[PDB]
């Protein structure tokens with residue numbers, strides 16, 4: 001039975017509002033409701049992997065696993081296997097997979113980050129899971145960020161703490177945070193970004209929602225505007241939103257938004273908002289297509305509606321050659337020409353590079369670059385033709401063209417990374433000098449760029 005080249009992944013996020021779910025939640029897993037919904041002809045086709053994030057979840061892990069497995073069994077007639085479950089306070093992530101995938105999944109990791117300081121520490125944060133699926137690394141983050149329309153900067157700070165401190169994926173990738181450790185990273189949750197309009201426009205906003213006219217609301221969505229200004233979620237994607245705001249509803253109906261300030265809200269308004277989101281980041285030139293992104297209409301126990309998203313995601317095999325793993329393949333090489341890093345740092349130390357990739361036996365350190373000043377004040381670190389020739393473990397182009405090289409630029413003085421990026425080996429040609437480029441980030445913020453040329457030799 002052949003190994004898959006693509007799988008489908010279900011992501012769900014639901015703030016349950018500390019209430020038990022209703023008896024039937026299958027519309028969630030079927031991507032039915034509002035927005036970009038799944039075709040009815042697919043209803044009996046199971047996704048390969050289901051990743052379920054909850055916030056304000058009142059259930060035990062056992063209780064929620066019961067409900068999830070029974071719901072998927074009812075839909076698909078398949079008994080899913082539990083890959084992982086992890087809970088921080090009332091924030092939870094469950095990963096379920098088809099039983100045929102049990103021996104394709106390995107290296108399962110879980111972690112959590114608590115976001116608060118002093119008073120703020122004690123209910124917000126994130127949980128995550130990572131694993132390998134054959135040759136492909138997958139990461140998943142469910143976060144419950146700070147509440148309140150006035151707190152978008154605190155949400156952005158929560159995001160950066162989660163990014164920095166969530167310990168998932170391959171610990172040998174020591175310069176890299178979760179935003180570079182995975183072929184595909186999915187980050188979802190009750191992110192709590194709000195529609196930033198005046199509170200006296202509440203009834204106008206509800207009218208727009210009833211007309212399914214979201215454009216003038218989305219133009220004020222804090223997550224879209226902060227992402228456009230590069231304040232958060234740099235280099236992530238989100239599908240277009242075509243479903244009504246998922247917060248804040250009166251419970252047991254979806255006919256009414258409960259926006260008014262009350263003692264229970266700390267005298268805050270909750271104007272209708274897209275609190276509940278799914279974003280992703282995949283390595284360059286890997287197949288990833290969003291197939292659905294929407295909200296259910298028939299699950300009403302919470303003041304939030306569940307959100308679903310589904311993806312078709314490219315995956316690769318666990319390649320074995322006569323040579324690697326366990327040795328290099330002399331017929332393969334990776335070479336770099338006319339390369340240089342442009343850094344935003346105001347510092348003047350020497351820099352070197354590290355190249356990290358699963359196609360190498362271990363990471364490779366370059367010689368120091370030569371610092372120059374750019375025309376507009378920048379630090380330019382020139383490597384020219386000085387970068388090492390990388391020796392992949394497998395030369396077969398059906399393996400090597402699917403790989404990626406992670407790059408860190410490190411201070412010689414401190415051995416700290418000043419920037420991380422990723423180069424695809426999915427080239428237009430082999431044995432040909434071709435341009436390469438990545439932005440460089442550190443703690444998820446832009447710190448520079450790396451560009452130059454690559455020349456890849458494969459056994460063809």
Ligand SMILES: [Mg+2]
Nearest residue numbers: 015017056303
């Ligand atoms: Mg709540």
